């Protein structure tokens, strides 16, 4: 094990920030979502095996 983390050179390391930005689902986006949701319901979603 030669594993040293990235804070060994503290005071010489920029910080980290995370910006959270949303995005609404447009009318056509939700329309296609519902269309493929119906297709998945007909197919049984291919999510059971």
């Amino acid at each position: 094990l030669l594993r040293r983390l990235k804070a060994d050179v503290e005071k010489q390391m920029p910080a980290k920030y995370e910006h959270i930005v949303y995005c609404k689902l447009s009318k056509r986006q939700r329309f296609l979502y519902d269309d493929f949701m119906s297709r998945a319901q007909t197919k049984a979603t291919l999510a059971s095996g």
């Binding site: 959270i20 930005v21 949303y22 995005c23 609404k24 689902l25 939700r30």
Partner: peptide
């Protein structure tokens, strides 16, 4: 990118009270 509950004009105007 986050798919939230279908809203717009909320980037910082909910955050101007959240500070």
């Amino acid at each position: 990118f986050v798919s939230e509950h279908t809203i717009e004009s909320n980037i910082l105007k909910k955050a101007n009270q959240k500070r």
